[model samples]
Target chain A: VQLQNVTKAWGEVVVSKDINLDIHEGEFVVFVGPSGCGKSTLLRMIAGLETITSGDLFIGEKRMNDTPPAERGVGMVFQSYALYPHLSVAENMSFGLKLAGAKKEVINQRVNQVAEVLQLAHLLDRKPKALSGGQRQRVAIGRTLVAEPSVFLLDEPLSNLDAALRVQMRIEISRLHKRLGRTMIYVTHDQVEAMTLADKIVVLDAGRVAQVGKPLELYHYPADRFVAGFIGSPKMNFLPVKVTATAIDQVQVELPMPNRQQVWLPVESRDVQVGANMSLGIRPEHLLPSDIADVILEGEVQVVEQLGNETQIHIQIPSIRQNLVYRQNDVVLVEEGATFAIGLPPERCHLFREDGTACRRLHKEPG
Target chain B: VQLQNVTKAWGEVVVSKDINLDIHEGEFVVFVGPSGCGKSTLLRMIAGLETITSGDLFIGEKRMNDTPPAERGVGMVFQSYALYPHLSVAENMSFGLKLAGAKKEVINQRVNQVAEVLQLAHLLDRKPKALSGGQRQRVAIGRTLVAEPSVFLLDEPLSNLDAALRVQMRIEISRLHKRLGRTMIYVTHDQVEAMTLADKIVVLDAGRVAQVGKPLELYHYPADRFVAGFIGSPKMNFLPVKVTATAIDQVQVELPMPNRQQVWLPVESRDVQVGANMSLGIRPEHLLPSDIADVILEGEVQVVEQLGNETQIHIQIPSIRQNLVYRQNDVVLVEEGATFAIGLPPERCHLFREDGTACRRLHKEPG
Candidate 1:
């Protein structure tokens, strides 16, 4: 599935602007963002449920922009399971096929096959109201599978369930992707789901794609500050700094401190200029309690959030005049009102310009 | 706050059965469980909002079971903000005080005090509709604070906020607790909130107290299988085993397998008999990837859930015919089809009787 420079607008307000995305066969891609970010709009456009004001969408070689939803060969599952209340699970699964004038035997065969795949064979005779939350969600997915579409579109399919059930369904969805090996585009506001399940994640911000890459790629090397803050749980902490010098393998920045000192960061980036103000992004996990010889910032702990396996320390640096989070392993000692020095490894610090665009490090391919 | 042999029954259904709890002065206790677990019922009974069918209720030596809600001197915050849409923030904060015939000057003084504490002084003139979700929640809290009650009851106060705002409000509540030093009893289904904010957590299950202890105590040493699975996120993995030998410091169990056979765990208690069926509970984080000398079982990797900081590996053991989750910091090299041995440190394995009660070590304290 492919979208080429797609744009959609509602009167004077643009919903999506100049979007370009290509999903390979059997790949699972997830769109994640805050509300009104146009992730759902983009997914709907791909499903042919919404008309694109400009550009084109293609499945294989066929243009789907002008095609009706029925002819687009895409299946969609919504947050609310859109099953027929009066109909049995089997009938709900077969309804779409029957509407398309499929034979009784064909519809039955398709419904049985999809139900078997979802482990809902026994639940086929039960009505939507009689089924459990997980079973209802499975039937929703089963309804989509019976259509046998080349691409699957899910719009927060697991949002209605409780947390534990949501986690269970997330694993089930990942297993389904592995079993079906079909191209899938999913939209959700959950970063954990996007990070765990997607082969590629598209971060959408204000109807524009902020960044798109593999989950770990986007996590480790976010294209911008927004992606950096949005991708990780508890979020990456940001600190204001001034780039004092630039080298082929490093960049030096002035640390916010009572001592007013500078530290050099080993970054292979020529885009960062000397004397330029920038924001340094460091994930909480990267902020260690044990100080190395080359420690950068020192601060006193203000609040300690202990989550059993890890402890998130909210430290207040008098010099920086900002609170930064430092995550320590369960065994690390952290006490409130205690002062400590923390190290920010040069390779781990992400540099962002005043406008939030990242300063990239160049890497040449081997010969 | 204290309850002795509390029992609530409506004809045939027993909502709460013989519950006995002691809440210390200035302590923050949270009643947490799934919906309809009688947590809210217990809170309502203590607040005089609901009648206790049969129980001894004491608040600082006063039997308040029949006391009217208005005379109880308890501040309650519901899940819903319940702010008057037509009233200004200051007016809302002072409403309860005004009803009690406080002087205008006294009302203004108390309202301003709480307003300053909640950082809502600037928004005092704004109505409920004009405030953000977090601000509205703060206003609701401020309304309660103006009453200046000795006891505070919050029923899922932060449940309505978004994830980001929830974290912020949780910190704010913790700080508020420190500043006021008031006795607070909160009810919530969120484990993170329960673990972070509670001085003591009351784990309720099926209208009964499963366990009552500090957050870390419950996480590390659960009283029963239900508490073991309920307290931690991702839950603990349970495997069936046959007790081979029982000792004061250690209990030996035979693993159902063709390749690997038996293992002995250093337990706190030895109450189970040899050859009795039991369950071994181990947290996902406690299980490692390597085949150490303490290894008791082997399985093939069925699914891997990578969530950046740590990975949860769901392993399928053909010998036990069950799926177990093994969490590791280092991502294992085992693929889906590769068989690997998993070791559980004897110290980490929890022994549970057939009825789900933990086999307590004779010398260990009840946690």
Candidate 2:
């Protein structure tokens, strides 16, 4: 499946700009962005629910821009399970096929098959109200599956479930993808879901494609400030810096240090200008205790959140009045209102120009 | 506040039984339990909304079990922030003061002071409909504050807001506690809130105080299997282990291995007979990579979750049909469907007897 300059627009304004992505057959591709980024619209357009403004959409090497929703062969599961409360799980699974005038035996066969896959065999005769949130979701997916759509389109399917159930369903989805090897296009505002499930991730910004790559590629090496901040939880911190000098393939950026001191960091960049104000991007996980890092920052501890396994400290640097967040091990040491030292390793630092374009990094660990 | 044998009962059934607790002044205590665990009823009883069946309650040095709600010197905030939709924020806050026939200037002074503390000063003129969820909650809190209650009782105050707003309001609530230094009781099913904000966490199960201690104390050294699973996220994993022998201060338990070999884990315990069927309770975080652990188990990797900052891998040990969960740093190493080795540290493991009582660990780190 592929999109060539797909656009969603009103009379004169386009909400989704020219978007082009080659989604390989059987690939789990995710379209991820902040809400109102046209991710859902893009998925809807591909599913034939939304009218495409102007673009060439191809499925199985056929120009299918004008295809109807039913013929798209796309199974769509939305945020709301949308299961029929009056209908039994098996009936819900068989409703669409039965309505399409499929044979009774065929409908029964398909319902049982999908029910077995979803582990909803026991609850086949139960109504929507009797099932848990996760079961309702599985029934929703199972209903879609019985129709046997080759391509799966899920728009925040796990959003309605609780956190624990979401974790469980994501595994089910991942396992389903592996078992079926169906081409799946999932859209979500959750970066974690995208990173875990998607074979290819499309980072959409303001209805336009920001970058597209593997999970770690977008993670370890984000293309710009937006992706860097959007892809990670707690977000990557942007420290205002100035480029002092340029040397061949490296640019020396000056970062603010404690006591009004400035430290120069050499980073790999292409055509970065001297005396230009840029920003240094550092992931929260990379920030560590002071002694091991080359650069040390002193800040007042603000918020410390502990999640059993890990702790997050949000520190406020009084010099800039900027809050720097870092992930620490579960046992937290920093005290509220007390000054703490945060470390930034130059090796893991990221650089971005004023325009938000990221400079290439020299060292990258192979996954 | 003190309660001696607090009980809430119906004609033949008891809902909350034999609950006794000492809540000191300026203490930020949290009551956390699942729905129907009587957390709300307990909070209501303290607020004088529920008549206690049998209890001796003391506020400061006075026994006030029969005191009316308004005369109890306690301000209450329910799960639903009951704000007057037609009234302005200022009016909503001043409503109670005005009803009591307070002077205009006095009402204005109190409203402004509480509003300033809650950061709701700017939105004083806005009606409840115009205010955000967090703002409405603060207005409710502010309204309660103007009454000058010695103690603040909040019943799932953050539950009305969404995730992000809940987080923001919890921090605000924490700051409010620090500033006011008032005795407070907060009730919620959300353990994260209890862990982050509470000075003392009261873990309730079946209407009884399962265990009460500092947040980290309950987390690292849970008194029993119940609090062990309740305090931490993802709950604690309980694996069946056979007690091979018992030493003076420790019990040797043999854990199941894929190769049919027994791995003996010496845990601090007493009075455990040889060949006893016991259970090992370990938090997911305690399980680590092979290199850092003493006992190892082989399992097939079932689910891999990437949260950008961290990754959670759920491994399925087919031998016992038990799924072991362990958190890995963002970059995951194990492959799906591939067999992997999981390690458990002997020191970090927990032991629970047949009666669910924890064998006290001899060493505990002070928070």
Candidate 3:
């Protein structure tokens, strides 16, 4: 599947612009961004729910931009609970299949098959009102599945489920996509969901693509500051700096600290120049308590958030007056009102220009 | 505030069993449980929405059981949105004050003070339909704040919001409580919210209090298997074992592992008979990838989730056919269909009886 130069606009306002994508067969892709970023509009356009203002969409070497919504083979699952409250699970699942003129025998067989796959077989006789949120969602998906659509588009389908139920449904969807070996384009505002479920993730910002890559690719090396800041939990820390030195091998920048502390990062030069205002990017996980790295940040801790799996610490830097967040998976040893040292490794550092453009590193690309 | 043997019921069907609690002045307390667990009903009882079956309710040493809700000083916010769509934020906020015949100046003063506190001053002219879910919730909260009630009761106030919005609102509510230093009673089924916002967490199960303690106390030393399992994310791992030895100072259990290994534990014993079928509990974080502790869990790794900030690996033991999830807040080192050895320290281990009650440990309690 591919979308070339696609755009969605209404007179003076544009929702999505200059969109280009190439999705492989049997691939699971996720479109992720904040609300009003036009992710849903983009997904709906591909599913033929929304009219395309421009560009071409193709599936398996066939142009599909002009395909009518009723004639399209793309199945779209929305955020709302669309299950019929008065219908039984089996009836709901078989409704569309029978309406599409499938034989009664085939409809029953397919409904039962999909119901079993979704672990809803026992609940087949139960009405939607009697079923749980997760169960009803499965029935909604089951209704779509029995019809045998070619492509599946889920737009924030798990938004209604509670925290625990959301994970269970997410896992179910991941397994479903794997077992069917079908093309799926899921849209969500959660980056964690994108990382866990997507084979390829498209990071959207303000109706445009900020970056598109494998989850780890975007994590390890984001193309620009927008992506670097968007793809991670707690967000990447950005320290303003003045460029001090540049080379084929390295780029050095002086911190905006009171002492003019100097640090040498190993990324290649893109717009590196002396006295140039820039941003020094680093993830919370990359900062450590050791003094073995290229740069050290010492400050009093502000707040500590202890999640069972990990701990996040906030440290105050007087020069910036903004606390930098630090994370550790293991037990926490630091406390509020206490001073600590954080290491910034050269290889793990990222440097971005003032215009929010990021540069590549000379070191080997991360796997 | 105090509840002495508070109960809610109709005939023999009790929704909230005899409950006793002391909500200190300016305290933040959260009541958390699953659906039908009566958490909401309990909150409603405190708010005077539900008639107390039999109990004495007190506020600052005065009995309030017969007081009308409108006459009571306790304020309440519910799971459903309560903002008036046709009314502006200012009108909605001051409606209650005007209904009670308060002066225009007093109403305006209170409305502006609350709007400032909730950061809703800029959106004061907006209606419910024109605002986002977060903004509408703030307006709802602003209306409650303007009432100037002595106690605030929030019954799943963030339940209607999505995952990201829920967190944002949670932080907002937490800050609001701190800024006012008022007594608060919050209710939710989301354990993460209970862990983060509560000065003390009350874990309820089937209309009864399972355990009540500070967030970390209940987390580190739950009184039963249900709480130990429910308090943590991803839940705790349980391995059925047989008590091979028990003494005043030492306890030993024989695991049903692939090797049937014997492990010695240091927890203080209670009704720990020899050859008793019990459960061995371990949190996901306590399982390390090396053999450095008293017990070892060897298994074939199943699913590996590589979140950018951390990694989760599921290791399945063939003997158990159940995967034990191990979490590391760094990078993924385990692969699918691979084998790994995980260490479990004795001090971090928990013991649960056949009836699900957890035994007390004689060592120092966790901080």
Candidate 4:
């Protein structure tokens, strides 16, 4: 599937702006953003359920810009499941096939096969109200599977499930992708779902593509500050810093501390000159609790969240009002209102300019 | 607030059976369980919104079972905000006070005070439809506060918000509890909220109190198998084991290893007998990655969930089809379909009898 320079608008408000993406066959891609970011609009356009104001869409090298939903060969599962209330599970699964002029025997065979795969064999005679939430969701997926479309599009399909069930369905979807080897595009506002299931994550911001890359690649190297803050849980901590010294091998930046002093970074950036103010981003896990003499910032612990395996300490520094998050092992002896020193390693610090764009740095590969 | 042998039934179905509890002054308690567990019904009974079939409820040494909801002096918030669509923020807050025959000046003073405390002073002119979900929820809480009741009862107050907003509101409610220093009782199915906000968590199962304790206490030392599996995230992993020997000082148990062997606990257990088949419950984080060592269970990796901060691996053992969850650090090595070994220390395992009752061993404090 492909979208070229797509633009969607509602009266004076624009939903999408000059979007371009190319999805290859057998690829699992995800569209993730906050609420009202136009991800659902983009998916609807691809499914032929909504009219495209101006765009070009192609499926399997064939233009589908004006094609009807039935001819587009795309399967869409909504967040609500949308199964027929009065119809049985098997009847619901075979409805679409029968509408497409499929024979009765062929529809029966296809429904039985999909039911066996989804473990819905015993639930074939049950209506939607009789099945559990997880079972109903599986039936929704089985309805799509029996169609055998070339492309699968899911719009927050697991949003209604409980936490444990959501995790289970996430794994099930990933396994289904591998087993079917079909191109699947999922739209969700959940970062965990995108990070876990997507082969390629497309971070959309205000209807436009913010960043696109493999999940781990995006986590390690985000294109902008929006992507950095949106991709991680508990959010990445940002602190204002000023460039002090620049050299070929490293850059010295001064961070906010009781006594402002310069901290060295291994990044060699040509664009960042001396005396330039920038923001440094560090994940909570990257901050270490050390009793060593050398430390970057000293602050009083404001709050502590103990999750058994790990402990997250929110510290309030003198120079910054917003609490900075620091994660450590559960064995750490940090108390509330206790003054402590913490530091971020040079290698883990991410620098961004005033305009929320990441500062490029030269990195050398290991031998 | 106190209840003595509370029992409520709707025809043949028992909603609440033999519920007896004493809530101290200024204590924040939560009732948490799955649907149909009668948490809401119990909360309503305490609030005097439902007629008790047979029970005794007391508020400050006075029997309040026959008291009407309005005369009970208890503030209540529902899952839905139930705000008047036509009323502005200030009007909504003052409406209840006005109906209670308070003077106009007094109503204004109280509404203004609550608005300032809730940071809704500037949003006083806005209607419910114009406010965001979080702001609307705060308005509901503000309305409850204006009444100045002795006790607060909330029924899934944050259930309507999105996941991110739900977490933020949970923390805000906790902060409010500390600032107001009032006794509050909240009900919800989300254990994370119950753990974070409640000073005492009441686990309800099948219309009965399964366990009640501090959040960390329940996490570390669950009273029974139900509480052990329900209090923690991802649930607890249960495996079959056999008691080889029972002694006053220690009990020897045999774990399900490729080659079975016995391991002895240092604590003393009087209930467990020799040659008794039991189950061992361990949390996901307690399992460590190891080779096929002296005491280990071999399994094939079924699913891998990478959530940036931690990884949840689901492994399928040969004896069961349900996958056992193993939480690992980000740096832990994992591969799909690979045979792996998992080991747990004796201190982390909880032994349960066949009837799902816990067999706790008493630990001696070191001198």
Candidate 5:
């Protein structure tokens, strides 16, 4: 499945603008962004549910821009189950095939096969009302599988389930993608889901593609500051800094301190000049232990969020509008208003211009 | 605020059963459980929206079981914002005061104070439809605040917002609780919310209180099998084992392996006896690095869930019904079919009898 310069507009409104994506066979591609970023619109256009205002969509060498949804050979699953309430699980799974004029025996065989794969064979006779949320979603997937589309498109498929159930289904979907060996395009506003399930991720921002690459690629080597902030939990911290010195493969910036302490960053020195102000970006996880840090900073603890296995410490640093969070993988013992020391890793530091573009890093990050 | 033998019943259906709790002044208490576990019912009973079938409820020194909702001195917020679309923020906030016949100046002063505290003063003239979701919820909170209730009750107030917005509001609510110093009772099914926000957590299950303690207390020392499974994310991994030996301070359980390997668990041996089947519980985080493990187990990696900050690897072990997960703090490099070795710390192992009662752990876990 491929999209080239695809744009969707309703005359005065353009929901999607010039999207170019390539989904390779057997690859899992995910589209993620905040609400109204056109991720769902892009998915719908590929499924032929929405009309493209311009450009082209191709599926297996055929241009499917004007084709009907059924003829486009794409199966779409929504956040809602959308199951037939009165139908049995088996009937629901076979309905699409029956409507497409398949033989009775063929439909039966297909339903059984799909149900076996989804572990729904025992509940084939159960009605939608009697099934659990996870089971209902499986039946929905089985319904799509029976039709045997060339590509699978899911729009926030796990959005309605509870958190634990969502995690279970995420793993199941990843396994199904591997076993089925078919192209799958999933759209979600959940960054964790995008990071875990995607072989390639497309980050969208206000109807435009912000970045597209492997999940960890976007996490470690973001093309811009938007991608950097959007990819990580607890978010990357942005602090105001002034460029003190610059070299081809390194740049020095003055920290917001009493003596204006300077630290060198292993980032490309592009469009950087002395005395120019810039934003420094670093992830919460990259903030190291004080004993291992290249530079040390101090702040007063504001809030300590404990998540059983990990703790996120919110701290108040002077000259910064937002709190700098240090996420440690243990039950950290800290109190509100206590002074805390944090380590800054120079190699992990990211520098961004006022325009939000990132300076390329010279150091290689872990995969 | 306190509940003594509180129960809510309708004919044969009992929604809340014999709940006894104490809410001290200026304490933040949270009620959390699965759906239909009577968490919301308990909250409503305290708010005087639901009548208590049998028991006493005390607010300060007075029994509030028969008190009207308005006279109970409690303010309630629901999952929905429930704002008046046609009314401006200021007007909406003053509506409750007008109904109670307060002076115009008094109402204006209360509304102004609440709006300022909630940072909603700038949006006071804007209607509900013009504000964002977080802002609208703030207006709802402001309306409730203008009533000057002694105890604040919130029922999943952040459930309707997006993830990032939810995180932002979680911190804001924590700050609000600190600044107000009022007794607060919150109801939510989201474990993370309960873990982060509550000063004391009450875990309810099927109209019964499963456990009650501080957040990390429940996380490290669960009272029963139910609390152990429910408190952590990815859930605790339970494997079938047989008790091979028992002592006062510890018990030995034989793992499900070809050699029947025995490992000692630092838990009180009460009902445990030799040749009895039991469930061994271990958390994903407790599965330590191989070099630090008391016992090493091998499995084939099935899924690698790569969250940007951490990794959760699901593996399939022989004779285990469910997959065992090993959680690491950094992104791990492992393939789906690779052989993975996991370390189990005996001090972290929990043993439960067939009746679901946990063998009390002896270790002093980190807070």
Candidate 6:
């Protein structure tokens, strides 16, 4: 499955611009972005629900741009389950097959098998209204599964479920993909879903592909500042910095610290020059406690949020316009209005040019 | 603020049971529970929007059960914001004061002061449609602040905002509470908000208070299984066990591990009897990695979710009906179908009897 220079437009305006994506067979690919990023449109285009304004969509060596929806062999699950309210689970699962005039034995066998796989065997007699969000979602997936499409497309399937139930269904979907060995393409605005479920993540920004890579590749070494800030919770913090020295594999920048100390970041310096202004990026989790860090900065604590297992502190420094956050694994005894100290590990620092593109990091970690 | 035997009922039906609570002056208290748990109804009773069927209400030294809402000296904010779309930010904020025939000079002074504090001074001229969700919430809050009420009531004020914006508004509300030092009563179904913002949390179940204490107090030592399961994300896992021995400060239980080892949990054993069946509760985060735990259990991994900074794995053991989740701070390299080992620390374990009541744990941690 692949999209070659795909574009979706209405005359003068384009919502999906020059999109190119390769979704290998049995691979799980996720499209993630903020609202109006055209992620759902991309999936619809592949499903043939939305006509492609230009370019080609291929499924197993066939260009499917002009193909009928039924011949596309793509099953799509929507954010809204859209089940028939009065239909029982088994009836709902077998409706499509029955409509296509499948044999009665074949329909019953397929419904039973899919229900067993989804742990919905006992719920087959219950109507849609009687089922829980997770159960209804399983029925929806089972409905598509009996069709046995070559590709599975899900548009925020877990968005309607509550937090804990969403986690449970997310696991079920991942396992289903592994068990069925089918190509799955999922779209969501949730970064956690994209990170946990995808074999490859496509970060979309304003209908354009910002970056496409393995989850941790985009996490640790985002191509630009947009992907860096969009992929993480509490997001990454950006600080203004001026370069003091540059080398092939490293760049030294002066931080907005009280002391005139310089911090070195391990990134390619091809586009960086001395006295150049750039943005420094660091995750809240990467900011270490003061005692162990090579460089320490102090600020006044603005807010402290204790989430049982971890603590997040928001601190304000006079020189930095944005509040810097320090998150730790344990509950830190801190109070608002108190002075706080944090350490910055230079190696964990990221450097972004004025153009918002990130310099290639010298270190690599497993995804 | 206090309630004595507070009850809200219509004829023979009761939605809120007899609730007795004492909220100290300048305290930030949160009422949190699942939907239909009567958390919002309790808040409304306090706000005088829903009259108490039987109880005594007090604000400072006065008994105010029959007090009208306008005379209650409390300002309430709702989940909807309820901003006037036709009015500008300042005009909407000052609407309440104007209706009361407040002098133009007095309303202007109060609205301006409140706007500056809420960071809405620049947005004062904009209509509600032009503002972001967070900004609209701020305008709602600002309108309440200009009233100078003795107590502030908020009913899930951040529910309409997106996840990222919710975090920002959460911090802002926390700061506002600190800066004003007013008595605040908030209601929400979100555990994170209750954990982060409240000085005390009241967990309601079926209209009755399940537990009331500091946030971490409820997190670390839930009074019942209901509170334990509801207070945490991914929640607590319950496993059936039979008590081998019981003592004043410890109970020895036989785990269904392959080795059939007995695990001792440090909890008061007043009601536990030898050879009695009970449930053992442990948080997902408490299940340590294979290397660091005191007692080890092995199971086949059913699912692995990698959330960049953390990893959550669900494993199924034949002896246990429910899947056990192991959450760690770092990315773990484990795959589905692999045998995984996790350690269970005795001190972190919780014991619950057949009636869902928790046995007091011997170990105590700071909240």
- Any runs in candidate 2 off by more than 4 Å, and if so which? A78-92, A99-108, A122-134, A158-168, A258-268, A305-307, A330-332, B78-88, B123-133, B158-162, B258-268, B292-294, B330-332
Native contacts recovered, in order, as a fraction for each? 0.39, 0.39, 0.34, 0.24, 0.66, 0.55
Cand. 1 TM to true fold: 0.93
- Please write out the lDDT profile of model 2 over residues B1-367, one tens digit for every residue: 8888989999868888888899989999999987789998988988898888997878887988867778889888754647877999999889888878999999999888998889888898987888777677677788889998999988775343336666666777788988989999988787777887888989888888899988878887888898888787677888888887777677777776555445544556667888888888877777888875567777788777656566788888765657888876656666789887777777778888899998867655446
Q: Is the docking of candidate 6 incorrect, acceptable, medium or high quality?
A: medium
For A1-367, candidate 6 gives per-residue lDDT tens digits of 9889999999889999988888888899999999889998888889888899989899988899889988888998754648887988988889889879999899989988888778998989888888887677688789889998999988865343346566667778887987887898888888877898899999999999999999888888899999999998888999999999976789899988767689778898887889998999999998888998578878999988878888899999879998998899757889889999999888788899999999888876666
Compared to the true structure, candidate 6 yields what TM-score? Answer: 0.93
- Show the colliding residue pairs in model 1: B268-B361, B269-B360, B269-B361
lDDT of 4 at A44: 92
* Model 4 interface RMSD, one decimal: 3.7
Q: Tell me how far the alpha carbon of residue A194 in candidate 1 is from the true structure, in angstroms, after superposition.
A: 0.4
Off by over 4 Å in 1: A78-88, A125-130, A158-169, A361-367, B78-86, B158-169, B330-334, B361-367
Cα lDDT tens digits for candidate 6, B1-367: 9888888899988999999899999999999998899998898888888888898988877888877788878888755648887999999999889879999999989988998789988989888889887687788788888888899998775343356666666777787888888999988788877897899999999999999999888888999999999888888989888899876689999887566789889998887889888889999988877698568878899888777778889999878888898899767888889999899899889999989999868887765
Query: Residue B358: error of model 4 in Å?
Result: 1.5
Score candidate 6 by lDDT.
0.86
Ranking by lDDT: 6, 5, 3, 2, 4, 1
Go through the candidates in order and give the clash count of each.
3, 0, 0, 0, 0, 0
For candidate 1 chain B, which ten residues in a row score worst on lDDT?
B358-367
Task: Show the lowest summed lDDT stretch of 10 residues, model 2 chain B.
Answer: B157-166
For model 6, the DockQ equals 0.61
Comparison by lDDT, 3 against 5, better one: 5
Candidate 4 clashes between residue pairs 3 or more apart in a chain or in different chains? none
Q: lDDT values of the candidates?
A: 0.80, 0.81, 0.82, 0.80, 0.85, 0.86
lDDT per residue as tens, model 5, A169-220: 7867887887887889988888877887899999999999999999888988
